[PDB]
Nucleic acid binder design. Sequence first.
RNA 1: CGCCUCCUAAAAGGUAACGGAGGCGCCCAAAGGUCCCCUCAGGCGGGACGGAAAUCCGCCGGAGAGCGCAAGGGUAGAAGG
RNA 2: GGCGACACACGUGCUACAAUGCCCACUACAAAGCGAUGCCACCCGGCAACGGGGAGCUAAUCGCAAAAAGGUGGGCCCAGUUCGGAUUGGGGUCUGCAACCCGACCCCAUGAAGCCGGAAUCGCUAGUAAUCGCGGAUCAGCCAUGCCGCGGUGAAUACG
RNA 3: CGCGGGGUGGAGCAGCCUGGUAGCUCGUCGGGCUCAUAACCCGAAGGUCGUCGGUUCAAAUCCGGCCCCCGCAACCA
Lengths: 69, 23, 83, 123, 181
Amino acid sequence: MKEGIHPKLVPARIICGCGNVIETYSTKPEIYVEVCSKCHPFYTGQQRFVDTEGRVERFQRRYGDSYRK
Amino acid sequence: GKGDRRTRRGKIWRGTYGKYRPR
Amino acid sequence: PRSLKKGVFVDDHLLEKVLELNAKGEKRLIKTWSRRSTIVPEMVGHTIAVYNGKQHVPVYITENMVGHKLGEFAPTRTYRGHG
Amino acid sequence: ARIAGVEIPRNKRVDVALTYIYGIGKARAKEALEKTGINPATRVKDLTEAEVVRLREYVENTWKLEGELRAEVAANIKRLMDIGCYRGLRHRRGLPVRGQRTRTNARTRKGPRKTVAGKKKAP
Amino acid sequence: PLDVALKRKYYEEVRPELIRRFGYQNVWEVPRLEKVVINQGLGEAKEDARILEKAAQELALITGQKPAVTRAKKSISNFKLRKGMPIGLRVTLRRDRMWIFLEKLLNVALPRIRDFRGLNPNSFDGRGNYNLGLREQLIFPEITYDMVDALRGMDIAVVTTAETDEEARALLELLGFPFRK
RNA sequence: CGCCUCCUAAAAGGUAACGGAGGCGCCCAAAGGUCCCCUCAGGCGGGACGGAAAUCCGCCGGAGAGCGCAAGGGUAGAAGG
RNA sequence: GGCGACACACGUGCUACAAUGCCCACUACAAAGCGAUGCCACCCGGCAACGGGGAGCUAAUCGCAAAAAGGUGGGCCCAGUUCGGAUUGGGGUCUGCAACCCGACCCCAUGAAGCCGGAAUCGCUAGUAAUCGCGGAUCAGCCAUGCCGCGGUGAAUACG
RNA sequence: CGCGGGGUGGAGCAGCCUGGUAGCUCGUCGGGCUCAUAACCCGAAGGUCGUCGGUUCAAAUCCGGCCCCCGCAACCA
Ligand SMILES: [K+]
Ligand SMILES: [Mg+2]
Ligand SMILES: [Mg+2]
Ligand SMILES: [Mg+2]
Ligand SMILES: [Mg+2]
Ligand SMILES: [Mg+2]
Ligand SMILES: [Mg+2]
Ligand SMILES: [Mg+2]
Ligand SMILES: [Mg+2]
Ligand SMILES: [Mg+2]
Ligand SMILES: [Mg+2]
Ligand SMILES: [Mg+2]
Ligand SMILES: [Mg+2]
Ligand SMILES: [Mg+2]
Ligand SMILES: [Mg+2]
Ligand SMILES: [Mg+2]
Ligand SMILES: [Mg+2]
Ligand SMILES: [Mg+2]
Ligand SMILES: [Mg+2]
Ligand SMILES: [Mg+2]
Ligand SMILES: [Mg+2]
Ligand SMILES: [Mg+2]
Ligand SMILES: [Mg+2]
Ligand SMILES: [Mg+2]
Ligand SMILES: [Mg+2]
Ligand SMILES: [Mg+2]
Ligand SMILES: [Mg+2]
Ligand SMILES: [Mg+2]
Ligand SMILES: [Mg+2]
Ligand SMILES: [Mg+2]
Ligand SMILES: [Mg+2]
Ligand SMILES: [Mg+2]
Ligand SMILES: [Mg+2]
Ligand SMILES: [Mg+2]
Ligand SMILES: [Mg+2]
Ligand SMILES: [Mg+2]
Ligand SMILES: [Mg+2]
Ligand SMILES: [Mg+2]
Ligand SMILES: [Mg+2]
Ligand SMILES: [Mg+2]
Ligand SMILES: [Mg+2]
Ligand SMILES: [Mg+2]
Ligand SMILES: [Mg+2]
Ligand SMILES: [Mg+2]
Ligand SMILES: [Mg+2]
Ligand SMILES: [Mg+2]
Ligand SMILES: [Mg+2]
Ligand SMILES: [Mg+2]
Ligand SMILES: [Mg+2]
Ligand SMILES: [Mg+2]
Ligand SMILES: [Mg+2]
Ligand SMILES: [Mg+2]
Ligand SMILES: [Mg+2]
Ligand SMILES: [Zn+2]
C-alpha cells in the first residue's frame, strides 16, 4: 500500500441501539449506530412490526350478521 | 388560525366542541 | 359513515334476490336500482346491474370491494375531457 | 438518520422534533414522551443516549411510520383505483375525492391553471 | 494478515457448507471472494467543482483505501462532456480490506438503508458476480450527516470465482447477504 | 491555373480529356527524444442518480477502434494510451 | 340520476401568509334573540363528536350560555415555522327510510399553495372604518365562510 | 446539368459569415380600462429552421444531392 495517501485502519468498536457491539476495523476508533443487523426487522426473522394485518380488510368487515336469517 | 380545526381557535369558528375545545 | 349502532344497509328487496341464487345454485343477472345497498359478502361472484340514472351497468363483485356501496361502481356522469 | 430513519432536528424541543417524522403529529409526540418519562421540553441536543433509544424504541414499535405508512397509504389508493370505485376514478384523473366542486377551485388537486381561449362577442 | 469476523466465518462456516452443498472435489473449486470494486460515477463534478475531493475523502473513510479518478473516454455533447473530464472515483478492495468493508456493509450499512427489504436476487452477473447500487453514502458508519455536503451514491461490484449464479448466491447468502427473494 | 489522396491506368514505372470524387496554403513546446508500462471498437449480461451513449464489473472479441485534419497505404510482436 | 360536471374565464366572500403574532392554562365584561317528538342543568361512559341517565322551564324564574378580542401566567424565537390549514389515507359520530354520486361533525395521520399580491380596482367622515365574538329566520340534517340583526374594543383624515 | 439569390413561430425580417445562445415588429390567446368597441396598459403561448445525406462530441449555421421560389444572361453571325 502506498505511503501517506490512505487513512490508517485501526481496531474499531461499533455500538448499536440494541446494546449490540461489533469488533471490526475502521478509520474511527469507536462508532455508535442506531441500528445494526442483529435487530433490523427484516433481519430478525419474520419480525412482523406494527402490521400483523394483511389486512384484515375487507371481507373481514363482519359485525354483524344482524340481517334476519 | 380560525381554519385550523385542531385548535381552540378553529373550534370557536365552527361553533363545535372537542378535545381541542372542551366544555 | 352510517352509525354502526344501526345495521349495515341493504334494501332487503335486493338481498332476497341474492340469497335465492345461492340456495338455487347461482347466478342470474341481477338488475337493481339500489345504488345505496352495501356490498355484502353474500354478493361476491355475482354480477348486479346497477342503474346509474340511464342504464343498468353490470358489476362483477369481488372480495376486495365489500365495504362499498353499489353506486360506487356505476358512475353517473360521462366526461371524456374538453375539446 | 436517528429515529426513525429521519434525523429529528436538534436545538428544538423533543415534542416538536418528533413531528418532523412522517406519521407523528403533535398529539402522538405528546404520547411517546409521556409514556417514556422524557420531559417534553428537553431539547433534542440534550437527551441521553439512554433516552435516545428509549424514545426511539417506543416510537418505532408503537405505530408504523415513514416508508411503511406511505406504502400502506399508496396501497389503499391503489386499491380504490383497481376496483374502479368512484373514488378510484378521482385519484386516476387527478380530481378531488371528497365532494368538493370543480367548476372553480380544486387547484391543489388540479395544479397550475391551463388557460384556454374562450367564446367571443360580436362587433 | 489479520482476524476479521467475516473472513474467519468464510473458512469456518461457509466453505464446508458450500462443499456439502455442491460436492467440490478440489479445494480450489469452492467459490471465493476475489475483489470488491466501488464506483462513484459522479459527473456532477464534471466542471461544476472538484467536489471529487470531499467525495474521495469520504470513500477513503468508508473503505480505508484512497480512490482513483476516472476520466471520460469519449466526448458527448448531450452529456455536456468533453473527453478526459474527471467524472468519477473507483477503488478496488481486495484481501482483508475487502473483508472489513464487506463485514460492515452487511452489519451496519445495508440495515441503515431506509425501507430496506433485502438485496435483489436478480442482480447476479449471470457468471457468478454481484452488483448493487446505493443512493446515499451516509449509509456507512464512517460517514455522518455533519461531515456530508451532498448525497452521492455508488455501484458496488463483488467478484467471485464461482462459475455460476447458483454457486455465487449460495456464497453470498451464507456469508450474510440478505436477499429480498 | 500550384500541391496532396483515390480511380480512370490495360497485375513494373509512367500515361490524356473542360473524365469520376475529395483535400491542402495548417498544426504540435508535445502531438518532439528516450526508457518503462498499458491495449482498442463493439456485442451481451450485471450496476443509485444514468438516458442509445458518462463512470464501474464479468464474459466474448485480431483489430472492424485509435493514429490532430482528405484519401490511400501502414499499424496492437504499435505507429495507438 | 341530474341541478354539485370541469381544459377554462369573471364577480362576491372566508381563511391566511405571522412575533402588535401563534399556542396551552388560569381569569374577567355584553346585547339582542330562541326554547314542549323544544332548550337541556347536573351526573356517569367516551381522547372527542356523542351516548345513557336525568332535574328545571308552558319561561325578567329553568336552559341555549362559553361571550370573544381582553387581563394574568407560561411556551415558541424568525424557520414555509408551534406561521397557514388546503389535499389525501384510516377510524368513528349523528340526523335521516337512505349520506355512492352528494351531508355535517369528531379523532389519528397527511401538512399543499401562500414571504403581503401585475395592469387595474372597492368601502368607510365617528362610536364610522378596522377588528372581536353572539343570536335569529330557513331548518330532519346541512355544504352558512351567505343574509337580517346584536353588542365588545376602537382609530386615522378632510388643506381644499 | 448557362449564372445568381432565397426557403427559420401565423405575416414580414435577424440569427448562417465565425458550429454550442433561436431574436425584432405585427399578429394570436388570458386579464384590465370603457356603457361598449378601438386605441392603450399588464401577462402568456407558438419556431425541432424546405428536404434527404455527410462532417463533427454537437448542425438553422459547414459540405454534397433533390424539391420549391424569385432575379440575371442567352453575344459575333
Ligand atoms: K461582328
Ligand atoms: Mg345471512
Ligand atoms: Mg396551529
Ligand atoms: Mg410529522
Ligand atoms: Mg362536485
Ligand atoms: Mg474437499
Ligand atoms: Mg490493511
Ligand atoms: Mg437473471
Ligand atoms: Mg453513518
Ligand atoms: Mg465469477
Ligand atoms: Mg504552369
Ligand atoms: Mg503550390
Ligand atoms: Mg501501373
Ligand atoms: Mg494506382
Ligand atoms: Mg523510374
Ligand atoms: Mg498529346
Ligand atoms: Mg478545391
Ligand atoms: Mg519544450
Ligand atoms: Mg503526430
Ligand atoms: Mg515521453
Ligand atoms: Mg446493463
Ligand atoms: Mg449507465
Ligand atoms: Mg476520430
Ligand atoms: Mg477532415
Ligand atoms: Mg485503421
Ligand atoms: Mg383570476
Ligand atoms: Mg364566502
Ligand atoms: Mg375574491
Ligand atoms: Mg348555540
Ligand atoms: Mg411546510
Ligand atoms: Mg415557495
Ligand atoms: Mg405548522
Ligand atoms: Mg376518509
Ligand atoms: Mg351525501
Ligand atoms: Mg417570513
Ligand atoms: Mg395590501
Ligand atoms: Mg356622508
Ligand atoms: Mg383576525
Ligand atoms: Mg339550521
Ligand atoms: Mg362541501
Ligand atoms: Mg352566524
Ligand atoms: Mg412557415
Ligand atoms: Mg414567417
Ligand atoms: Mg451573417
Ligand atoms: Mg455564432
Ligand atoms: Mg421570439
Ligand atoms: Mg386579447
Ligand atoms: Mg343601457
Ligand atoms: Mg376593448
Ligand atoms: Mg415570450
Ligand atoms: Mg441543403
Ligand atoms: Mg443548434
Ligand atoms: Mg461585340
Ligand atoms: Zn442492533
